[PDB]
Amino acid sequence: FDPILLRPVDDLELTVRSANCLKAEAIHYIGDLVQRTEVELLKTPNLGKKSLTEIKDVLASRGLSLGMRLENWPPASIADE
Amino acid sequence: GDNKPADDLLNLEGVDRDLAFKLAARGVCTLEDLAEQGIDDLADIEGLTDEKAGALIMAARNICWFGDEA
């Protein structure tokens, strides 16, 4: 289970503003970020031009926003525990 | 500053001259500048609502990103 996804968007080294954008969509775990594609996010005003830049910075790590798709969220790695 | 709305912002669909003036009052002048504003920046004006402000942001951004296509 990618630790960057399990970590709360608030944990992002970026200012809370970065997480506030995605979090505004009721998102607390970066994992949800990979659940939705950036396009679906760019189609919402809640995101600001500056917020997009912060996403690219975190996306540079390729740890989140890799356009992945999860059926629920907890990968086989997390398993029951 | 008069902050007059540019033809692009005034020619934006879903926005009237009154709304274009209020949005331009925030230094915005071209539809592109309007897209730079965020839903929180639009809340500054009561005339605009968080839902209506966001709809204007995507509409303006869509025009720029989809401006290549008629």
PDB file of C-alpha atoms in Angstrom, chain A residues 34-61:
ATOM      1  CA  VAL A  34      -5.487   8.204  -6.947  1.00  0.00           C
ATOM      2  CA  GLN A  35      -9.109   6.996  -6.939  1.00  0.00           C
ATOM      3  CA  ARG A  36     -10.115  10.045  -9.008  1.00  0.00           C
ATOM      4  CA  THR A  37      -8.208  11.089 -12.150  1.00  0.00           C
ATOM      5  CA  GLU A  38      -6.688  14.592 -12.295  1.00  0.00           C
ATOM      6  CA  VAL A  39      -9.046  15.345 -15.206  1.00  0.00           C
ATOM      7  CA  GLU A  40     -12.125  14.751 -13.027  1.00  0.00           C
ATOM      8  CA  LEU A  41     -10.459  17.150 -10.565  1.00  0.00           C
ATOM      9  CA  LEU A  42      -9.531  19.791 -13.169  1.00  0.00           C
ATOM     10  CA  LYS A  43     -13.242  19.764 -14.076  1.00  0.00           C
ATOM     11  CA  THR A  44     -14.072  21.316 -10.684  1.00  0.00           C
ATOM     12  CA  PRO A  45     -13.736  24.992  -9.630  1.00  0.00           C
ATOM     13  CA  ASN A  46     -12.852  24.033  -6.037  1.00  0.00           C
ATOM     14  CA  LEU A  47      -9.320  23.703  -7.461  1.00  0.00           C
ATOM     15  CA  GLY A  48      -7.311  26.904  -8.030  1.00  0.00           C
ATOM     16  CA  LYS A  49      -4.599  27.606 -10.630  1.00  0.00           C
ATOM     17  CA  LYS A  50      -2.022  27.688  -7.809  1.00  0.00           C
ATOM     18  CA  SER A  51      -3.418  24.443  -6.349  1.00  0.00           C
ATOM     19  CA  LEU A  52      -2.707  22.704  -9.677  1.00  0.00           C
ATOM     20  CA  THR A  53       0.983  23.651  -9.365  1.00  0.00           C
ATOM     21  CA  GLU A  54       1.196  22.048  -5.902  1.00  0.00           C
ATOM     22  CA  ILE A  55      -0.350  18.852  -7.317  1.00  0.00           C
ATOM     23  CA  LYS A  56       2.327  18.696 -10.039  1.00  0.00           C
ATOM     24  CA  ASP A  57       4.982  18.974  -7.305  1.00  0.00           C
ATOM     25  CA  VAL A  58       3.567  15.965  -5.422  1.00  0.00           C
ATOM     26  CA  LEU A  59       2.776  14.215  -8.722  1.00  0.00           C
ATOM     27  CA  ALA A  60       6.501  14.500  -9.526  1.00  0.00           C
ATOM     28  CA  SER A  61       7.035  11.772  -6.907  1.00  0.00           C
TER      29      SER A  61
END
